[PDB]
Amino acid sequence: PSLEDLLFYTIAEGQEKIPVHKFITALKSTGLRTSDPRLKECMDMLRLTLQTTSDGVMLDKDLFKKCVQSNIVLLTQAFRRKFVIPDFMSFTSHIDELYESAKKQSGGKVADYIPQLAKFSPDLWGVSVCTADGQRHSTGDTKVPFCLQSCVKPLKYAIAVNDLGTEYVHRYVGKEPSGLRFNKLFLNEDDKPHNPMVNAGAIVVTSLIKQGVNNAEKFDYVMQFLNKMAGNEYVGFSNATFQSERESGDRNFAIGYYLKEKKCFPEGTDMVGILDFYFQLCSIEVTCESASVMAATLANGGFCPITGERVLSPEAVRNTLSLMHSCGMYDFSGQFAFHVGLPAKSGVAGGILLVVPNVMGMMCWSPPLDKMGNSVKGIHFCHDLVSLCNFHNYDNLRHFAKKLDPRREG
Amino acid sequence: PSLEDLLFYTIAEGQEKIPVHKFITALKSTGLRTSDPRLKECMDMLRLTLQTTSDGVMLDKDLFKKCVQSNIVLLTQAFRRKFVIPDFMSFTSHIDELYESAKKQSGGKVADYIPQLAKFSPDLWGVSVCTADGQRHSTGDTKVPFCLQSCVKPLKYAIAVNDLGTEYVHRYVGKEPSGLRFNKLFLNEDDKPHNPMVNAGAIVVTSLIKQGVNNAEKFDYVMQFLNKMAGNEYVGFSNATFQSERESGDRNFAIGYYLKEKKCFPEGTDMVGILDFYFQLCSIEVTCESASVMAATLANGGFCPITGERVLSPEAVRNTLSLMHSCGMYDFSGQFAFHVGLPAKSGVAGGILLVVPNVMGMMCWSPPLDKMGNSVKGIHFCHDLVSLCNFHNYDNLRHFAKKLDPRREG
Amino acid sequence: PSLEDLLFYTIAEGQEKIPVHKFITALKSTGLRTSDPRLKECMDMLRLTLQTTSDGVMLDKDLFKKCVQSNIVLLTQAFRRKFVIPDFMSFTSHIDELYESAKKQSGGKVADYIPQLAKFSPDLWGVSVCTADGQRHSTGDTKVPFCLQSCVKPLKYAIAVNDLGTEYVHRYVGKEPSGLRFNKLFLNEDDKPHNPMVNAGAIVVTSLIKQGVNNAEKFDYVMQFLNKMAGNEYVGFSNATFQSERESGDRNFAIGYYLKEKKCFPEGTDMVGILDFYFQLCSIEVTCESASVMAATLANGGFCPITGERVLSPEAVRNTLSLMHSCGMYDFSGQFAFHVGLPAKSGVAGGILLVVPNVMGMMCWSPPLDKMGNSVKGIHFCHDLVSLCNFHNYDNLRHFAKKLDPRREG
Amino acid sequence: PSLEDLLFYTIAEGQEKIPVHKFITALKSTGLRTSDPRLKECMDMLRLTLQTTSDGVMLDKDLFKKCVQSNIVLLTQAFRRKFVIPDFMSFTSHIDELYESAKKQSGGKVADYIPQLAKFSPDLWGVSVCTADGQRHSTGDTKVPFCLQSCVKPLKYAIAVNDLGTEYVHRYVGKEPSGLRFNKLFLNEDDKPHNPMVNAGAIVVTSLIKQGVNNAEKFDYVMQFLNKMAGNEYVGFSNATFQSERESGDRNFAIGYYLKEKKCFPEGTDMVGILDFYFQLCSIEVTCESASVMAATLANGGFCPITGERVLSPEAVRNTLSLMHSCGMYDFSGQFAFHVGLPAKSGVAGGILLVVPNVMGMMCWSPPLDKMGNSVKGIHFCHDLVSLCNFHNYDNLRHFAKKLDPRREG
Ligand SMILES: CC(=O)Nc1nnc(N[C@H]2CCN(c3nnc(NC(C)=O)s3)C2)s1
Ligand SMILES: CC(=O)Nc1nnc(N[C@H]2CCN(c3nnc(NC(C)=O)s3)C2)s1
């Protein structure tokens, strides 16, 4: 009995040889991308043999196993439908239907307050999926870079807890949400900000990351860390946006100085500096696709699904999904956790970084925001998703009414 | 082949005939209780043939088949380790350790608010587990009756969504927590109570159940409902507590009038009569055991696990688990939601109604309260549980560090 | 020299005999009403004399002195222009224009929450003046009985602090205003209602008066007190208003319950009767004329200006004038102090009971209210009054611009 | 007849010639100060004849003529007991008693957040009186200089309203006290600061004085005013304090940024520059004596009582006294208006600028502050002072019980 030869027949169709193309589409339909980091060695040995014998391009039992043995455990789970969503082909057809269903939601205003977002077209709309198993799908403008803005807040929160610990970080920032008209306060009853998803707390989380090092290396570190999360897909920086967020954050200066007077930063902080760090962190660039991996890294206990590398300690990822669930969507967090149940984070550029724990992570992007600050199509999507799929945090996996369960076969 | 036959060998140990007590001990080790209502036909036949043959006592292939023909589906998956917690014996040893660690935390004051909760001894402490499959276990003072008090708030809420739907019920009561010092207000900004787990929201929810009918038939309605949730285990009513909780609820009368003034009850409400129904529902008795089935019903999408009967819509069990999450523990709901992640509701008798969605329902009961209103041992047990098992709503099922996962074998 | 005779010459104007009306007119143009209690002996000896010798009807040095001697100090001051307003004849002209400019101010809604405030016409409008010397003037509808409503709040607080003293009284009630979105709260952080001009605090004041006797004598005591405050002018009761005010005070009961549960009342209170007692007090009836005398007892150190009797301790009248300055116009209290700078109390029936300390008291009444609860005309007239005369509480009495002073002669 | 002639006999006491020192002691017992700027011609001419005839030194009716013609009117009101306080020598014995009674109240903490306030001894304690007529008295450390700090707030508010009128000024700053625990919020519901006596309201006012000019001139403009209000007595400036005030003013900067974001300043407002100018205005020095004349200009309709000069518009002085009464004493403002009922303003250096309209103004200085911000001896002195005299805003000038009234005689 042999792992590679068995798989060779399950694709062989009883035929004596396997065309190369007939393998590459058989792969793409499990949800995997040929470019997958975990797959390169199987792909390099396809790049190899596609010059040696140009008179093929068939694969022996030998030649197949020549390419596939390095990555056979993960190749077999794909082909025996062990992936978390087994029939991935159907599910993306629903992601597409759900996409077009939101793509018609024309209302909302593009953030005007800096020119770099006022220049983005309200017509843009991309949705990118990434499972805890690397199965990927995209619809729309999913390769257009845009800023995280406050989609970075849980990411840097995860970074800080990962390095310093729950208990150190939660001397400096609370861990609840404030109250639907405690929106305007900075500090709770203990003179910490209310949670790391609000600007008072985020500006505080930022002063914890990589202390004793200067602000340009601090940035490189967070760039390094965000890189491991998206498994080395697009992570960028628009100096443009950064300039406008610098000239115009009289509010964050207001918050910052209140925090300084009231003694909430760690001993030896240079407040005005980390306002600059914080402005930088918000002008970090992502695509739909690359962030959906960051999102799937949270969905997977802190292990990147396209690389398998442990990026975040399981304490940081739990902590974060806990605070996305209740402080994640500005004043809509309450109604959002009720009707959707998924930890999410929004951003004024139009981002919505979505986790479905133990299934997949997402990124949805339409620049027009509603009157509370959330992507109009973004919100309309997440509702439609939970509507359709028993992905609500407090659905029941065994008795789930008429909703569809993508983890199940038939 | 034949199911009963195959199960027969699974227990036969290659022998020709199984002793009854061998069959019994094999059944109870799966955590099933022989008293199970899904098993009554199995037991009714064993009890009868161990009459019609004092000649024994020993079942042959065809004699064991007469007994288990009727409950075979459930007997098989009990023996084929197909329950949610497959190693139920090892899990209950864990519960006993957690219980016995909670049991050394003698802090807290019991509720002397009325002569009936001050009558309960501080040394009482009990935990009842009922899984979504029916596997019971308890240790401690698990058969003492105590009033639900505010542990009934999610139960009554669930019934009102179950009968009226989400839209109707949430015309009358909000969805979100209130804010760690908006605990003294009744209404939120739309002049609705903040959510169904606060006194003012519970009362308004009460005025939605089974309108037009007198308070007697209302009460019967809610009890015949609460019986189906507990699989017809103990659901009682204390009159001693009801008479106290009416001569001494000045503040619910305070809330009751503020609500009428602000036009929060449905048209044709009798406000004082509904305070009475309110005082009543709080005086309903459960034991630890009867209530762990109640919680278990919400852990199971609305189906009572020990009877298989559908007690609540999935839409009402979802809403209840969402609002228990965030608003379920008075002023500790934020800290609980962070450090525990399970839907939970607390009373002043010393109850804590616990749900692990898709796993089990629990009910812990120690009378003495901490300064926030919560059973001291209860809160200790619930932290101890989540540190041990990956049940925190935001643990990963795949990567979970030092924690045991009782959903798995080895 | 002699005091009766000198006076007699002053009004004689050198001629041998004074007619009867020529005196009565000379007396009225000082603003004393011929029916002043302190002139009875005089007016009596005048109605005696005006039957004896019908062949006059004129007096001489001897016979004038026969009538005026008993009342010669008061008659003289009036006639040597010693009264606080020397030229009271022009002052009432200005009070007429002020009344005409206000009856032009046609807006506002008459209170309709009960059928007894809604029956009144929106064109009823009256002002009544009464000085620290008893000079009287009225224009409009000043003898129409109407209901004090929250105008009674200072009058009972005065009775309260008169009988037991500032210190005792303020163990149950704060002494500031609360803040312009603190109006729905009942208690400050000491768990006392914020001041006696709010319904939370009024209700608590009410519990303090004549404790230990029943609600009939209690009301009688207050009635007797209010008689002495108005020099026995019209005071009454609307059993009509009191009935529909008790069937509708759901908030008032809401308050009463809250204060009970928070133990805001003195030992041995029957809360539900204090609300009955309080409802009654809010239906005490007055006219513009009678009530402006109550305000004149407040302007005058506690002595009723038309009887001479001490009715309130100079301690109680200060504390009340204090808390009408800051708390007496509901949410318009802040603006009203700023601009009018006079202590007033408004109530929902359309009355404004206004003090100009050390000068005069008023009552303005016109039932159409505005969107903070104040008589529209009554408000307008108040601004106009202080735009005219240096009566504003922080006006200079020596360097006061083009403002007009009725206390100065020329 | 001639004014100097008869004023001569009132001092002559029959004799042919008045000793000059006799005349002076008669003139100082009216509480006039021989330095008084309205008496300068008289004191020059006394010295000149004390030169031109050592031959003496005693004034016949004709040489006394030669000296007092210049300032005769002021001198006669002073010698004919026509001043606001006729018996000034008695009053000052009282002011000493109360001063000596506060001197025993040794509690509090000297403000030490900067080293220029910790520099002052806690046993420093001064009071200085100046009437509307320029009668003077001081006892204690009344020539020591100290910074106004928040005492400057009403002085600049008055400047801005005098220069701009009420309506314009109150576009940028409301006019009510916030509410006894909305002390941390910066703005009221209209996004204006609460009033001109809170650190945020003071700041925006500062932005309205003399817009369009640099800070050096703006300061020169403001100190022009102050010198006039104190009759050109000591007005100075601690640059040592302005330095420490700006280096430590994190919350003031926190405030300044917040106000810029909510567009609270006039267009074209340099926010950091307005902040500098704010720290300057707070570092302006006075002594008890010089600052008692500031206060007195407010008691006096805007006229400086010792120069006769018009400094502030009656509209400006009204609004400032109104806002001092309700907002001037930090969180003590509610209780201070109740129990003292005088327009007063405290500061962190220990001063309390105090006013009795139509009588006098004061400055009580003692560096130790209480837990609310107020001089321990200052608050003590004002309580004692008004228990003694009928100066409480709502005392009666006719029936004032056993209080002394320094405005009458026998
Ligand atoms: C928009 C909105 O929220 N309106 C309202 N919602 N709820 C309310 N409750 C009122 C009844 C009891 N409440 C008090 N609670 N605490 C109090 N005293 C202190 C010191 O806090 S009074 C006020 S008013
Ligand atoms: C209607 C309106 O204007 N509301 C507001 N006014 N000002 C605001 N700005 C915030 C910045 C400083 N503030 C804080 N003060 N205290 C805090 N912490 C605690 C425990 O209270 S945060 C408030 S929001």
Measuring from atom 18 of ligand 1, which residue has the nearest CA? C187
Ligand nearest to the CA of C185: 1
- B187 CA to centre of ligand 2 in angstroms: 22
Q: Are A4 and A11 in contact (CB under 8 A)?
A: no
Q: Is B184 in the pocket of ligand 1 (CB under 6 A)?
A: yes
Quote the CA–CA distance of B47 and B49 in Å, as a whole number: 6
Q: Any residues with CB less than 8 A from the CB of B72 and at least 6 apart, and which? A: B3, B4, B7
> Residue C278 annotated as binding?
yes
Quote the CA–CA distance of B270 and B253 in Å, as a whole number: 13
Residue among D354, D364, D366 nearest D391 (CA): D354
> Residue A393 annotated as binding?
no
User: Are residue C113 and residue C46 in the same domain, yes or no?
Assistant: no
**Chain B positions in Cβ-Cβ contact with residue A323 (cut-off 8 Å):** 338
Burial-class residue C48 by CB neighbours within 10 Å (0-12, 13-18, 19+). exposed
Interface test with D, best of A184, A199, A261 (most D CBs within 10 A): A261
> Residue D278 annotated as binding?
yes
For residue A364, is it left (φ>0), alpha (ψ between -120 and 50) or beta?
beta
Give first-to-last CA distance, chain D, whole Å. Answer: 29
Burial-class residue C321 by CB neighbours within 10 Å (0-12, 13-18, 19+). buried
Helices D288-299 and D215-229: crossing angle, nearest 10°? 80
Q: Is D132 close to C398, i.e. CB distance below 8 A?
A: yes
- Chain Cα centroid distance, residue A137: 13
**Chain C positions in Cβ-Cβ contact with residue B203 (cut-off 8 Å):** none
Q: Is D257 close to A254, i.e. CB distance below 8 A?
A: yes
**Chain C positions in Cβ-Cβ contact with residue D315 (cut-off 8 Å):** 401
Interface test with D, best of A253, A270, A271 (most D CBs within 10 A): A253
Quote the CA–CA distance of D285 and D238 in Å, as a whole number: 7
Helix residue ranges per DSSP H, D192-267: 199-206, 215-229, 239-247, 250-261
Quote the CA–CA distance of C146 and C116 in Å, as a whole number: 10
Which tokens belong to D311? 């400094």
User: Are residue D126 and residue D268 in the same domain, yes or no?
Assistant: yes
Q: Is C254 close to B254, i.e. CB distance below 8 A?
A: yes
Which tokens belong to C111? 């209170």
Q: Is C337 close to D357, i.e. CB distance below 8 A?
A: no
Ligand nearest to the CA of B198: 1
Location of structure tokens 């910074």 = D147
> Residue D169 annotated as binding?
no
Quote the CA–CA distance of C195 and D34 in Å, as a whole number: 49
Residue among B325, B94, B387 nearest A315 (CA): B387
Quote the CA–CA distance of A140 and D336 in Å, as a whole number: 67
Largest CA distance in chain A: 77
Pocket of ligand 2 (CB under 6 A): A 184-187, 189, 258; D 184-189, 258
How far off is chain D from A155, nearest CA to CA, in Å?
A: 27
Indicate which technique resolved this structure: X-ray
Quote the CA–CA distance of C208 and A122 in Å, as a whole number: 66
Give me the sheet containing B235-237, strands edge to edge. Answer: B146-147, B284-286, B235-237
Location of structure tokens 């004061």 = D362
Q: Residues of chain C whose C-beta is under 8 A from some C-beta in B? A: 250-251, 253-254, 257-258, 260-261
**Chain C positions in Cβ-Cβ contact with residue D303 (cut-off 8 Å):** 399
Interface present between B and D (3 or more CB pairs within 8 Å): no
Q: Are D139 and D102 in contact (CB under 8 A)?
A: no
Q: Is D303 close to C393, i.e. CB distance below 8 A?
A: no
**Chain D positions in Cβ-Cβ contact with residue C303 (cut-off 8 Å):** 399
Q: Is B175 close to A335, i.e. CB distance below 8 A?
A: yes
Last residue of one domain, picked from the residues A81, A111, A131 = A81
Q: Is C314 close to D395, i.e. CB distance below 8 A?
A: yes
Last residue of one domain, picked from the residues C81, C97, C112 = C81
User: Are residue A70 and residue A108 in the same domain, yes or no?
Assistant: no
> Residue C330 annotated as binding?
yes
Quote the CA–CA distance of A193 and D197 in Å, as a whole number: 28
Measuring from atom 23 of ligand 1, which residue has the nearest CA? C185
- φ/ψ of A369, rounded to 5, equals -105, 155
User: Are residue C143 and residue C36 in the same domain, yes or no?
Assistant: no
Distances (CA, A) of B53 to B47, B59, D311: 10, 10, 118
Ligand nearest to the CA of B259: 1
**Chain D positions in Cβ-Cβ contact with residue A253 (cut-off 8 Å):** 257
Quote the CA–CA distance of B276 and D15 in Å, as a whole number: 97
| CB < 8 Å & 24+ apart, contacts of B213-216 | B215/B273, B215/B276, B215/B277, B215/B280
User: Are residue C326 and residue C189 in the same domain, yes or no?
Assistant: yes
Residue C128's DSSP bridge partners are C138, C363
DSSP code string of B314-358: HHHHHHHHHHHHHHTTGGGHHHHHHHT-S-EEE-SSSEEEEEETT
Report the half-sphere exposure of B69 (CA within 13 A, side-chain side). 7
3-state secondary structure of A394: coil
Q: Is C186 in the pocket of ligand 1 (CB under 6 A)?
A: yes
Which tokens belong to A345? 């984070």
User: Are residue A23 and residue A71 in the same domain, yes or no?
Assistant: yes
Distances (CA, A) of D4 to B152, D18, D30, D63, D72: 95, 13, 17, 10, 7
Q: Is C399 close to D314, i.e. CB distance below 8 A?
A: yes
- Chain Cα centroid distance, residue A315: 18
Measured between CB atoms, which of C174, C337, C399 is closest to D303?
Answer: C399
Residue D364's DSSP bridge partners are D127, D352
Burial-class residue D36 by CB neighbours within 10 Å (0-12, 13-18, 19+). buried
Q: Is A181 close to B175, i.e. CB distance below 8 A?
A: no
Header resolution in angstroms: 3.0
User: Are residue A325 and residue A288 in the same domain, yes or no?
Assistant: yes
Q: Are B96 and B140 in contact (CB under 8 A)?
A: no
Q: Is D396 close to C178, i.e. CB distance below 8 A?
A: no
User: Are residue D88 and residue D40 in the same domain, yes or no?
Assistant: no
Q: What angle do CA B107, B110, B114 make, to 5 degrees?
A: 170
Residue D285's DSSP bridge partners are D147, D236
Measuring from atom 1 of ligand 1, which residue has the nearest CA? B189
Which tokens belong to A255? 């918050």
Q: Are C147 and C117 in contact (CB under 8 A)?
A: yes
A:B CB pairs within 8 Å: 123
Q: Is C190 in the pocket of ligand 1 (CB under 6 A)?
A: no
Residue among B126, B133, B127 nearest B32 (CA): B133
3-state secondary structure of D136: strand
- D185 CA to centre of ligand 2 in angstroms: 4
- B186 CA to centre of ligand 1 in angstroms: 7
Q: What angle do CA A303, A307, A308 make, to 5 degrees?
A: 40
Residue to probe by mutation, ligand 1, list C184, C190, C260, most atoms within 8 Å of CB: C184
Interface test with B, best of C185, C261, C264 (most B CBs within 10 A): C261
Last residue of one domain, picked from the residues A35, A66, A81 = A81
Domain that residue A49 falls in:
1-81
Helices B152-164 and B288-298: crossing angle, nearest 10°? 40
| CB < 8 Å & 24+ apart, contacts of D162-169 | D162/D302, D162/D312, D162/D313, D162/D315, D162/D316, D163/D209, D163/D210, D164/D208, D165/D315, D166/D315, D166/D319, D168/D208, D169/D196, D169/D205, D169/D208
How many domains, in total, are found in chain D?
2
User: Are residue B63 and residue B174 in the same domain, yes or no?
Assistant: no
Quote the CA–CA distance of A29 and A92 in Å, as a whole number: 11
Q: Look up residue A172 and give its amino acid.
A: Y
Quote the CA–CA distance of A358 and A372 in Å, as a whole number: 29
Measured between CB atoms, which of C250, C258, C260 is closest to B260?
Answer: C250
User: Are residue D2 and residue D138 in the same domain, yes or no?
Assistant: no
- D179 CA to centre of ligand 2 in angstroms: 13
Q: Residues of chain B whose C-beta is under 8 A from some C-beta in C? A: 250-251, 253-258, 260-261
Other beta carbons within 10 angstroms of residue B224's beta carbon come to: 10
User: Are residue A224 and residue A265 in the same domain, yes or no?
Assistant: yes
Measured between CB atoms, which of D299, D301, D398 is closest to C358?
Answer: D398
> Residue D393 annotated as binding?
no
- Chain Cα centroid distance, residue C393: 18
Q: Are D401 and C314 in contact (CB under 8 A)?
A: yes
Quote the CA–CA distance of C212 and D302 in Å, as a whole number: 54
Q: Are C385 and D287 in contact (CB under 8 A)?
A: no
Interface test with B, best of C246, C255, C258, C272 (most B CBs within 10 A): C258
The full length of chain A comes to 410
User: Are residue A197 and residue A220 in the same domain, yes or no?
Assistant: yes
Q: What angle do CA B295, B301, B305 make, to 5 degrees?
A: 60
Which tokens belong to B325? 């999450």
